[model samples]
Target: GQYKLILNGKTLKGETTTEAVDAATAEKMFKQYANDNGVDGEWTYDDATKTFTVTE
Candidate 1:
C-alpha cells in the first residue's frame, strides 16, 4: 500500500528538544545532506514549531 512508503519516524540531526535554540539550524543541515545525497521527496521545515516532515 502507498501508506507503507510513509515513515513513522524522521531522522533529524543536531540538537533537538530541551536545548537553547530551535531546530531551524539543524533542519537546514538536513537540506544540505539531502542535496549531497541526491535525495528526492516532498519535505519541509518549520521554525515556528521546530519540526521537519517528508512525504514519499
Candidate 2:
C-alpha cells in the first residue's frame, strides 16, 4: 500500500517504499527517515493542527 506522508501540509514521496497506513506508521516512518538522514529533531503529527513539526 502507498502512503501519502504529509509534512507541514506538503505530501512527501512514498511511491515505491512502504507508506504509512495510519498515524503511528507515519510517525515511525518519519522518525526512521530522520534517523537515517542523521537528523536530530522531533517530528510531531498534530491531527488537530494538521501539521508536522520538526524542531532542531
Candidate 3:
C-alpha cells in the first residue's frame, strides 16, 4: 500500500519512492534499504504510532 509521497513540494513529490508503512511492509523496505546501502541492523515497528524505526 502506498500514498502520494511528497516532501516539501512538487519537486520532491514522488510516490514511486513512497510507501505506506506497516509491519510487513516496513520490514521489506528496511531490508532492501539495508542490503543496498550495505547496512546490517535490527528494526522495530510501533503499531500504535504506525511508525517504523531502526534500532541502534
Evaluated with lDDT, which candidate comes out highest? 2
**Candidate 3 positional error at 1, Å:** 6.3
Q: What is candidate 1's lDDT per residue for 1-56, written digit by digit as tens?
A: 00111222244323323232446555555555555655556866565555565443
Provide TM-scores for the models: 0.41, 0.54, 0.48
What is each predicted model's overall lDDT from 0 to 1? 0.44, 0.51, 0.45
Candidate 3 ranges beyond 4 A from true positions? 1-17
In candidate 3, what are the lDDT values of residues 4-53, reduced to their tens digit?
21122222222224365645765576556545554444555555654444
User: What are the RMSDs of all candidates, in order?
Assistant: 9.8, 6.0, 7.7
Pitting candidate 1 against candidate 3, the one with the higher TM-score is 3
Model 2 residue 43 lDDT? 56
Question: What ordering of candidates by lDDT runs from best to worst?
Answer: 2, 3, 1
Off by over 4 Å in 1: 1-20, 44-51
Tens-place lDDT digits, model 2, residues 1-56: 34333333223422223445666776677667755655565456566643445555
- Candidate 3 local accuracy as lDDT? 0.45
Ranking by TM-score: 2, 3, 1
Q: Give the clashing residue pairs of candidate 1, or none.
A: none
